[PDB]
Amino acid sequence: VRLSGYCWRVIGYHVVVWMMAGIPLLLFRWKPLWGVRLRLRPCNLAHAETLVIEIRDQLFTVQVQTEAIRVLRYYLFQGQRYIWIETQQAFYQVSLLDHGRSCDDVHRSRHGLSLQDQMVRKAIYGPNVISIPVKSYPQLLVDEALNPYYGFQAFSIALWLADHYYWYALCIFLISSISICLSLYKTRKQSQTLRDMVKLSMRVCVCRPGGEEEWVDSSELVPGDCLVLPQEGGLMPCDAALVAGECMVNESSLTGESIPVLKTALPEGLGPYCAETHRRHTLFCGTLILQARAYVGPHVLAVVTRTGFCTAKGGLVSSILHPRPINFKFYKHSMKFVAALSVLALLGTIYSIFILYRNRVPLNEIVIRALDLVTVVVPPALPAAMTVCTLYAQSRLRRQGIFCIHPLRINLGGKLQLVCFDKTGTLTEDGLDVMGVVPLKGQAFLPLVPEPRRLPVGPLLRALATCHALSRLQDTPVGDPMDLKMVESTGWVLEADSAFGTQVLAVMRPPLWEPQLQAMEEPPVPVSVLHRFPFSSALQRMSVVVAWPGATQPEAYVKGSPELVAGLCNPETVPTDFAQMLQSYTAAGYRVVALASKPLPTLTRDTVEGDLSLLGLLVMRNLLKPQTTPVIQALRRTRIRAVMVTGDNLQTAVTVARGCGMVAPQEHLIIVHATHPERGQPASLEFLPMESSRHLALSGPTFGIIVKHFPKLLPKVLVQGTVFARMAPEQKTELVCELQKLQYCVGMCGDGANDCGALKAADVGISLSQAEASVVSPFTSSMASIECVPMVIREGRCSLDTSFSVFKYMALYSLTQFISVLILYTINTNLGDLQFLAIDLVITTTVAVLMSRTGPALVLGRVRPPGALLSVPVLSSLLLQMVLVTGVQLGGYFLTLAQPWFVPLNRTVAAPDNLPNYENTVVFSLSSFQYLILAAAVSKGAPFRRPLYTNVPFLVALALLSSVLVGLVLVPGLLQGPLALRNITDTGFKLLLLGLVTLNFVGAFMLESVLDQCLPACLRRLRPKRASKKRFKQLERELAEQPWPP
């Protein structure tokens, strides 16, 4: 995180690099800083340094722009704007100028921002736009085509053009152009799918200190400027603190869930505007405002707080544009693999140079042949194969209805070994059923009431009717499902005239019915709502203040989790057997929410939910979705660990885990309960063995106590723990972080608004109730069920196998072609000119692009894909396949030598001037069929991929190439002219060649099958490793020798 500043000699450095002609590799290597400094006009003075290099320990360089009003030196890094302060000499982030600003200051910013201050803050903070520039086509060409690989391909094109191999040069050019086009299309789509999301362009009203009215574009906003919000509704131009009125918004673009959320005006007072503690008082960029009410004045006034990239949406966009490096390695071993391949290539080109020197050839031709061989070693289709494989996988996922912002994470799904779920919404149905309400008398519960409609007028009925954040939107109430079903159960239909405190936020009317019963005593009267305190998952609570045409004083009603609410209630109002009866309902799997009240003596949220008194419990059913038990059973069958992380009660979570199969029968479960220290001793960490493998379940506060007071025992709990309950979102992301610390590949599926942090922290985050692509999590599904989890895993495995099948095959292709030409070099032939074109484009490129189209296996398995190219089976398969191919080619050559008809090539004339000569044709035919054979063999089916005959384009390609090659052998000759073949004029020997290559086909398949069948057993019997690289496996073993809980 160190920034170093540096100010005719640069042209000298450029000329030196050009003369060297490969200085870019040195500057793209361990010593890039030295070259940069030598070619940057070094000058440490930051005030004068126009260039700055930042190191984050990784190495980035950026200019220093200067904007004038007088002078302002700023620079952009990672999308964030930093500016230079003359009074400090250092660089400070734009977001940190107005840090610690007090809420009273935000309120005093109610008045306008003058045009002078507007332009000053415009120059400082820049325009209010999340800038994702559109790249001109030549910019993309210079960005992508400029790299060592394509430069080497251009060199190969030049070299093969030098020796009159026009066709081969042209086809290499075509392959490179196709690869560049595919990379460009991938990058363009990647930029466009993000740019289309941040498209905010609309006029907004803002009031000046004088005139108090002006319409400006969304980009013309700056921090500290007020904003008149549109009461009809619409998108939010930028991040602003709500200063006046109330707002109903739909912030699904950065939260996942699409339920309405209530934002109340910022509470006036002294203290910093955190923007995270006041999250309920802030409107975020790119969020739809369902409505905005004033209740105190003409307009709903907000104050712009942060604009541009520093907004939360801007931060997520910045993360997407510059993602963090992947923690889990995918290969991290290809250096040794390509080193071994290069070793083989060098041992081959040594033979090439030696045998060429053996015969009479000019030294220039000798070096030309050597460089030709080296160019043939490198295949030009590798980047195209990678890109098309990734595009195919992403298209498959999109066709299944799952969208990934950046497909680079797809392969992570192929090596997930732990998946977290949240109970409500994802595992269970979103909706709820109100089973009933349990009331109190003064300190003793009463029988459950099925329909709350039949309650008498009193605190409980009023609390059920009034305590929520429901709002009518187009003749339909909307809000939390819990609140909607509760109010439906009561029947009190949602409907100025301030009673005591302020203007009423809402009014409720009791349903007219029972002329005798309802008016039997105190007929119901409508109830007005004065103050509302929205619900937040961090504090399991919601407080409302209400009055009615009676109401000698107002009344505050609090709805919350039973444990926390009972803690807040008056101790003598809570019955002694609260815990057991709550278990009696939660152990049955019911969601239970407590209602309490206090009569206010005629307002910050703290003084409301204080000396409360229990009114009752609300028991409501919540059933598992019908496609969660099979998914959990499949995941557990494949030894993929499944964990529940939820903010609900521990008893309900345990019951749901038992029902959905996370805790199958005959699997003992313990409850871990750590008591907070009471100033006499630490937590005891009590264990309660439950009654119908080892499983542990613990709530949020005990999890925090274990984290902060038993660090030694934390790994064992995390390894054995499966059901975590009553966790705040912060605790959820903390648990994900801890699981990752144990070297787990942690994926997660979540509903919204309490999983966003955990979803982002997770290696593979999935959001369910999302219409389309979102910046909420790396992956997002359209359908709402857990079934998306296995497919993302399966495709990932299908990718990991598929990628390997490319690196294998194109390596085989890289080297099976390498040996063939060497054989010809030993006989002084050079494999023809159009023959190279036939080998590459007709046969190889089409197969390489088509082989990755195959889909996933449609079922999971316990066998994980490999994680290294240089494993024993892979290298063994490569070597044995090379032995088979070399044997076939040499046998063909030796048999062709041993025929009645034969005339050796005229060795005194260099190729291609001696073609077809009866040796080039046979080697070429064998090589072509060998490429097809290798392609067919490398492309496996089970357990990860479908059988080869699934993707009908690839199978059709294989069939057509085989047919045209067979024709090329079994005809008097139709392409033998252009391909320079000698037209073997007998119908007997060519049939023998066909039989021999059939034997080669059979040999390759039997070889690969025998390897797959036998080598794993040999490795199990031979080298008994006892893997301990990952800490969680070590902990699993240690628990296996002896469990920690007795």
Ligand X SMILES: Nc1ncnc2c1ncn2[C@@H]1O[C@H](COP(=O)(O)OP(=O)(O)NP(=O)(O)O)[C@@H](O)[C@H]1O
Ligand Y SMILES: CCCCCCCCCCCCO
Phi, psi dihedrals of residue 886, rounded to the nearest 5°:
-60, -45
Q: Binding of ligand CCCCCCCCCCCC at residue 995 (CB under 6 A)? A: no
Sorted by sequence, the CB contacts under 8 Å of residue 844 that are 6+ apart come out as 379, 381, 813, 931, 935
Token pair 């919601």 is found at: 542
Q: Binding of ligand Y01 at residue 28 (CB under 6 A)? A: yes
Q: Which of 230, 233, 481, 978 binds ligand Y (CB under 6 A)?
A: 978
Q: Which of 136, 476, 552, 908 binds ligand NAG (CB under 6 A)?
A: 908
Sorted by sequence, the CB contacts under 8 Å of residue 320 that are 6+ apart come out as 194, 405, 406, 775
Q: Which of 60, 166, 357, 687 binds ligand CCCCCCCCCCCC (CB under 6 A)?
A: 166
Q: Binding of ligand CCCCCCCCCCCC at residue 399 (CB under 6 A)? A: no
Residue 649 binds which one of ligand Y, ligand LMT, Mg ion, none, with CB within 5 to 8 A depending on kind?
none
Do 627 and 783 meet the contact criterion of CB atoms below 8 Å apart? no
Q: Which of 326, 970, 974, 1018 binds ligand D10 (CB under 6 A)?
A: 970
**Which SS3 state, helix, strand or coil, does residue 833 take?**
coil
Catalytic residue list contains 225: no
Q: Which two tokens stand for residue 963?
A: 């047919």
Tell me if 475 is assigned to a ligand binding site: no
Backbone CA torsion sign across 713, 714, 720, 724: positive
Residue 338 binds which one of ligand NAG, ligand Y, ligand CCCCCCCCCCCC, none, with CB within 5 to 8 A depending on kind?
ligand Y
Q: How far is the CB of 367 from ligand Y01 (least distance, A)?
A: 7
Instruction: Output the CA torsion 506→511→515→517 (10° steps).
Output: -100
Residues 357-396 that bind ligand Y (CB under 6 A): 377, 382
Q: Which of 379, 425, 589, 796 binds Mg ion (CB under 5 A)?
A: 425
For residues 765 and 732, give the distance between their C-alpha atoms in angstroms, rounded to a whole number. Answer: 13
Q: Which of 139, 147, 553, 906 binds ligand NAG (CB under 6 A)?
A: 906
User: Which span sits near ligand Y01 by CB under 6 A: 283-291, 431-439, 954-962, 1014-1022?
Assistant: 954-962
Residue 991 binds which one of Mg ion, ligand X, ligand CCCCCCCCCCCC, none, with CB within 5 to 8 A depending on kind?
none
Name the site residues for ligand X (rule: CB under 6 A): 422-425, 480, 482-483, 535, 537, 540, 542, 559-561, 593, 646-648, 751, 754
What's the burial of 37, exposed, middle or buried (CB within 10 Å: 0-12/13-18/19+)? middle
Q: How far is the CB of 148 from ligand Y01 (least distance, A)?
A: 4
Q: Binding of ligand NAG at residue 360 (CB under 6 A)? A: no
Cα angle 323, 325, 330 (rounded to 5 degrees) comes to: 125
Phi, psi dihedrals of residue 502, rounded to the nearest 5°:
-150, -175
Backbone CA torsion sign across 92, 93, 99, 105: positive
How is 202-239 classified by DSSP, letter by letter?
-EEEE--SSS--EEEEGGG--TT-EEE--TT-EE--SE
Residue 648 binds which one of ligand NAG, ligand CCCCCCCCCCCC, ligand X, none, with CB within 5 to 8 A depending on kind?
ligand X
Q: How far is the CB of 85 from ligand CCCCCCCCCCCC (least distance, A)?
A: 56
Q: Which of 956, 992, 1002, 1010 binds ligand Y01 (CB under 6 A)?
A: 956
Instruction: Report which residue type is found at 705.
Output: I
Q: How far is the CB of 963 from ligand NAG (least distance, A)?
A: 36
CA Rg value for the chain: 36
Pattern of binders to ligand Y over 167-186, x per CB under 6 A? x-------------------
Instruction: Report which residue type is found at 607.
Output: T
Active-site pick, 225, 422, 480, 483: 422
What's the burial of 61, exposed, middle or buried (CB within 10 Å: 0-12/13-18/19+)? middle
Residue 425 binds which one of ligand D10, ligand X, ligand CCCCCCCCCCCC, none, with CB within 5 to 8 A depending on kind?
ligand X
Q: Where are the beta strands (DSSP E) in 513-572?
A: 527-536, 541-547, 555-560
- Choose between 690 and 841: whose C-beta lies nearer to ligand Y01: 841
Pattern of binders to ligand LMT over 320-339, x per CB under 6 A? ------------------x-
Do 212 and 283 meet the contact criterion of CB atoms below 8 Å apart? no
Beta bridge partners of 747: 419, 764
User: Which span sits near ligand Y01 by CB under 6 A: 19-27, 517-525, 656-664, 820-828?
Assistant: 19-27
Token pair 């250092």 is found at: 90
- Choose between 61 and 334: whose C-beta lies nearer to ligand D10: 334
For residues 923 and 900, give the distance between their C-alpha atoms in angstroms, rounded to a whole number. Answer: 19
Q: Which of 953, 995, 1016, 1043 binds ligand CCCCCCCCCCCC (CB under 6 A)?
A: 953
Tell me if 755 is assigned to a ligand binding site: yes
Q: Which of 147, 553, 693, 906 binds ligand Y01 (CB under 6 A)?
A: 147
Cα angle 622, 626, 629 (rounded to 5 degrees) comes to: 100
For residues 820 and 470, give the distance between their C-alpha atoms in angstroms, rounded to a whole number. Answer: 76
**Which SS3 state, helix, strand or coil, does residue 478 take?**
strand
Q: Which of 207, 382, 545, 822 binds ligand LMT (CB under 6 A)?
A: 382
Contact footprint for ligand LMT (CB under 6 A): 149, 183, 338, 341-342, 345-346, 349, 374, 377-378, 382-383, 386-387
* Site for ligand NAG, rule CB under 6 A: 906, 908-909
The footprint of ligand Y01 (CB under 6 A) covers 21-22, 24, 28, 146-149, 151-152, 155, 178, 374, 388, 391-392, 395, 841-842, 845-846, 849-850, 953, 956-957, 960-961
Could you give the residue numbers annotated as active site?
422
Residues marked as binding for Mg(2+)?
751, 755
